[model samples]
Target chain A: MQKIGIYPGTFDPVTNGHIDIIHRSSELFEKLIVAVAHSSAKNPMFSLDERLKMIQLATKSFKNVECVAFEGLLANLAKEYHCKVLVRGLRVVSDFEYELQMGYANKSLNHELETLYFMPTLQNAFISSSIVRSIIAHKGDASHLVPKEIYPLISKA
Target chain B: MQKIGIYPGTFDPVTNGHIDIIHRSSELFEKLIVAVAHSSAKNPMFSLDERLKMIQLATKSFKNVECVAFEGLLANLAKEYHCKVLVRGLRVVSDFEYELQMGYANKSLNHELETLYFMPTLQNAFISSSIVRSIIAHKGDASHLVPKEIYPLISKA
Candidate 1:
């Protein structure tokens, strides 16, 4: 029996931090599922398919990783995939508090579901997709803030 | 010329995270002034004197560090101390955003004052005074969350 891992996010064109977590999770599990959510109470940025494509490109080299477009309750999808372990990146207080809330909520939905928080490398601690996007919006360089492969994809968009 | 560095905070019983930043700053500056403010628009917890006592005890080993009870404008305190460089620990975006705001504000008040953001070691990423205070309030173990030297002082309070 293979141990499966689930990681779901709005993605909105994943960044170096997301890729770091995905890579680390892939190493830990036999097979890793990357769920790029369709919406998350957000108005803009990259669409679902575009975001999914970006994740696929970023994660293509990982033999055990598969990327997909997803919607609906997260634990519901995790249940369907038969994954007990749910992975997330730990950033900070506001982010951690909300993650803690959702982690418990997801566990309530599925008793076997467990959440693991992974910290990004020291450098990525200050880098987030939202911050990178802000820099891009201002026409400031975000080249160093995102994954090199992803830079070209989101740069032109 | 003895370079002076200013680190101002409500302190409210400083935690391991604050101690880490203080240690690093103490090593960098010829003289480090740790200002524990009288109030921060808060009603209660630790009094100004108690907080200053905690800082003084925690920082007693650092020869270059000085602890003082302060009130009013942070930039003004730095100016009075003849310190042009102000130091702060970098934690999260919300924490960071407010720091960035105040850093600019302080610079506006005194053009020579400069702010430097320092990241605590990775372990302290999730450790903070407010979180430690919450854990203690709930009767949880905050021993690992705060400086060992200061634990006894606060535990009885």
Candidate 2:
């Protein structure tokens, strides 16, 4: 049985925290699909193609990882991708409440898809794409936070 | 000039976590108004009257604090009460991100009002009103998490 996992995020400018999830999820599942959410409501700094390319470049070392973009319901995306597990990262209790609510709702709406949450490595818990973007935008050193390959692109953004 | 503060929450069953913020805010402001938001959209487990009573009963020992119920926009409520600061609790990094976004948004929307976030006490950082409600609902001991005065009511609930 192929245990594939779906790791979804905005990945506006792939940070180490995202790459951490990609690596971690890849270990548990035969194949890890990194899906960018193409939502109209959110105005992201990076284009979909840029975000996909950045994730692709960041996760190049991971053999079982693939990157793509999807729109609409996530449970449906997981079903379409033939993934039983939806991987999420939890950095705090408040996150647990919202994610738990969503997990329960997703499970209720589609029983076949189960969500698995992983706490990011402790140091990476506070490192978010927004923070990295803010640092880069302000001409601060975020080279340590994001992958070296994507840091220059984010810096330019 | 009275530096008043507003501490707002559904506080389904006010826990020690909520009490900690109530006390912490009391130190930072001349007067702390603990407001029970009667937002019908949240559909709280406790009635507006009961929730107000519980907060009032729990906070009676704190001279600088008072409990009341209010509706509508929280920023508007802060303005109406002449509050200079809005007290919010920060438990984790995820909470920090969400709260930071709200704090910035509130600042942008209401230039006169400032939201000050207090990190939850280490012991009560993990405690939440819903966690207490869940414990009581399932017949688990929540005496330590909730105020001693409200333990019986929670157990009865």
Candidate 3:
């Protein structure tokens, strides 16, 4: 069907949670574009280059998956990529109230943009970008929480 | 302000996770009413009588806490109870997206109704009614997952 889907996130050192969505979305979509947003307000630990490298390296096995940097509204980015299916992740106990609002706004921006929510595994439910960052900062073992391929990249300064 | 708050749920067995919110909500409100819904659609393992007994017995320590079985909309129940403040629990990895829609609907049903969300401790986050039931059915020790007072009540047929 050549169905292309877009998964947008800071991917500030893509953790197991991101990897989970990427892997599952890969199976569902003919082609999955993992859009790494350069969200400066979020204070990302890694640069766009670093994030791209990490996600691309980790998803090397998935031939249909591609990584790119995006800015401004995701609705705008989706048009540029010519992808209508928007992929979103729902982790454990997240304040998705705000995410729904964002999704609604995206819908308003692009009427054809259909948003899909993917959930992580029960074990990966608690693993988040900020939590992973804190664990690494405190010199804790986050090797199990993040992808093995990108662990060294995120764990190091 | 001597405010009264209401926490409504099936509490099918009143797990420790429920205890965490009840305990915390007790500290915040002058009086906390735990409403056990007779939601047959939910297919509760225990009956209304059993659920009420377990929750009431488990919350015996908090002097300000009381338990009641309710049917119909919680917003309507809150009106009868005269509690403007509504207390809700946010556990880990649950379908809270639907919950927000329910919350919004409740607001429409009762304009003065105010809802507050209380989160369970991280350890208590994964303990849910159905999960606890499965553990007990399989002869697994769910003693630690449920309230100490109501363990005997819920564990038995």
Candidate 4:
């Protein structure tokens, strides 16, 4: 059976780190879905539509990746799509612990949903959408954080 | 008021990453204590005593940096030393979330304790004690991971 994995994130303003994760996870799974969470409890700068568009544009190079919007529980969405694996990217031990906790909790909710963690390729590990948003909100340079295509969109906003 | 900071970790075998964090944190605090946690939680390749000795030898060069051992809550240790700041090194966003939770928990326990996160220097962000230990445990080459002075000692162990 073909392995299908879901890479879900609150890509309020997707960064290169997120894109790098999508590309890396694509290699491991037969089909990788880059799903954007619509209901972000955290106040986000970009709308769900805007975030999905940005992810779509940035992930065009990868053929195995598909961009979509998700609502309610992510585990339920993954289950509907017959994707058993939920791919999460970790940048550090602290990240690992929190992600592990979430993974275990999700597993408890749905025993079939398996969460796999891929450590970010060292260089991009420290970059996050929050930091990128903070840097951009302060009118600081954020070209290094996101793709060239997405930077203009975030900068204009 | 003298600003003391605590950078606690189980440096089973200290790497350049730990050294970089120590040097970076020293700039922000009056005195930075590198406390090695004596825990049997994770199967450590090196004994706590051996790890402490290695850290002591490696950090002997920094006058502001002192190596010690602690066995309980890190927040208590920081409070005991009158440290208003706990310096942590971050290399990714996951670290941010994990640190955010810990920071809130510590603050709940003792509102006086503040967290200051320093990004690992670009070159050494990916290095971790576990990475170093796994290499040493497998009898693999880790000259670049561990300091030159301690490589032989860790290799034999």
Candidate 5:
């Protein structure tokens, strides 16, 4: 049986860190859905379409990966996609606490869905969309933190 | 020249994630000091002495690693220890934001101290002291999350 997994996040601009997780998770699952959250309380810098485009561009090389935007409950989306596993990245303890809560909450909604956590490659672990956005907003160099494809897009924004 | 690195944290109860970083960092630097912060605004569950002892017991396998307790500024501790590299773990974007601010702040305080970030091993990346404390407090099993030496202590607490 082909194992299907969904990696959901609000990839405001999809930094190298998100791509790192996407590639690693893609290898583990037969079909890996890179689901971008359309609505986030964090006030994402890019539109849902823009975020999806960036993720698609960054993950185009991965054969088993697909990028799509999602809204409403993630458990519902996981069920809709027939995903048994929900892949998440564990970068630190704080992420663990928040993600663990989300995992339990999701489990409450969908008993079949399990959350699997992966750590980003050490080199790109510190690269996050928020960090990239802050650096860009301050006119600092963030070229190295994001995917080369979206470098020009974010820089020009 | 031997490079001395310091990994400082308020390790209220050192988790497996921290031990993973200590092992990885020990190989990179000639000497790795796992410094336990004495004071934290977060109100630690364990005392400075207990935290230091737990880290010491957890890191005894690494010959190049040593555990110590520190009070006041990290820059001062780094300078006092003659450590040029300040090693920290990056687990998520939020960690990156907080650590980045601390890194810049430390750089201003001690120009010679450079912050080096490491990511915990994927398996242990989600383990944290706070989470461990919550689990143990609620009478949940956390044996796998912490070192064997402190397992009894934490479980019995």
Candidate 6:
């Protein structure tokens, strides 16, 4: 049976950190769905379509990886996508607590959906969308934090 | 000149995550000091002496790693120990922000001291002292989260 996994996140602009998780997760599951959250109260820097396009560009090399956007419950989206596993990245204590809560909540909602957590590569662990946004807003260098394809886009943003 | 790096934390009970960083940081510097922070308003579960003892026992196998306890500013401790680098582990975005702030503050206090951030091994990145303590407190298993030497100690705490 092909094991399908869904990695749901508000890519905003899809930093290298998110791409790191996407690549590693792609290797683990037969099919990996890079699901972008449609709208966030955090007010993402990029629209859903823009974020989806960026993810598509960043993960084009991964044959098993597919980019899509979703709204509402993640477990529902995972189920709709026919994914048995929900992949998440755990970087620190705060992430652990939130992920743990979400895991339990998701499990309660869909018993068949399992939350699998992965850690980003060491170099990318500290990078986040918010930080990238702040740096770009200030016209600071984000070439090292984002993917090469999106470097010009972020620089111009 | 021998490069000395200091890894300072509250340690409360010294989880495996901190030890993982310690082992990795040990190889980068000629000598690495695992400094346990003094009493904090955060109300640590373990006393300073207990934390120091646990750390010393946990890191005894590393010939170049030393365990010490300190109070007041970390930059001061680094200076006193003749450490040129303040080694820290960056696990998530939240950690990144606070660490970035502290890095700048420390730099302003002591220009000679440089802050270096390392990411914990992927498996250990999600493990934290607070989570381990909560698990142990709730009579849950924390054997895999803490060092073998301090497992029994943590369980009893």
DockQ of each: 0.02, 0.03, 0.03, 0.02, 0.03, 0.02
Residue-by-residue lDDT tens digits, candidate 2, B1-157: 2578888888898888888888877987889999887756556888888888888989999999989897655666787887768888877433566676556544544568778878678999888777777777788888889788877665775
Clashing pairs in 4: A126-B92
C-alpha lDDT values of all predictions: 0.79, 0.77, 0.78, 0.78, 0.79, 0.79
In Å, residue B52's CA in model 6 sits off its true spot by: 0.7
How far does residue A71 in candidate 1 sit from its true spot (Å)?
A: 36
Stretches of model 3 off by over 4 angstroms after superposition:
B1-157
Clashing pairs in 6: A91-B91
Question: Compared with the true structure, what per-residue lDDT tens digits does model 5 show for residues A105-132?
Answer: 9999999988998888877665566656
Off by over 4 Å in 6: A1-97, A100-157
Candidate 1 local lDDT, B1-157, one digit each (tens)? 2499988888876977788899998888999999888885874478898899888999998999999888788888888888899889876423567888999999999888999878777766656576556445534456776778888888878
- Residues B103-145, candidate 6: write the lDDT tens digits: 8999899888888887877776666676566555435556767
Candidate 4, residue A115: Cα displacement in angstroms equals 0.8
For model 5, how does the per-residue alpha-carbon lDDT over B46-134 read when each residue is reduced to its tens digit?
A: 77887888888888889989888866567778888887899888764335556875676566557798888888988977777778889
Docking class of 3: incorrect
Error of 3 at B29 (Å): 48
Q: Write the per-residue lDDT of candidate 3 for residues A1-157, one digit (tens) a residue.
A: 1268898988877888888778766765678998888888888888899888998989999999988878878888888888776887766566675655565578679876756565565467678898987887799998998899888887776
Q: Which of 1 and 4 is the better model by lDDT?
A: 1
| Docking quality band of candidate 2, CAPRI definitions | incorrect
lDDT of 3: 0.78
Which is the better candidate, 2 or 5, if ranked by lDDT?
5
Model 1 Cα shift for residue B104 (angstroms): 0.5
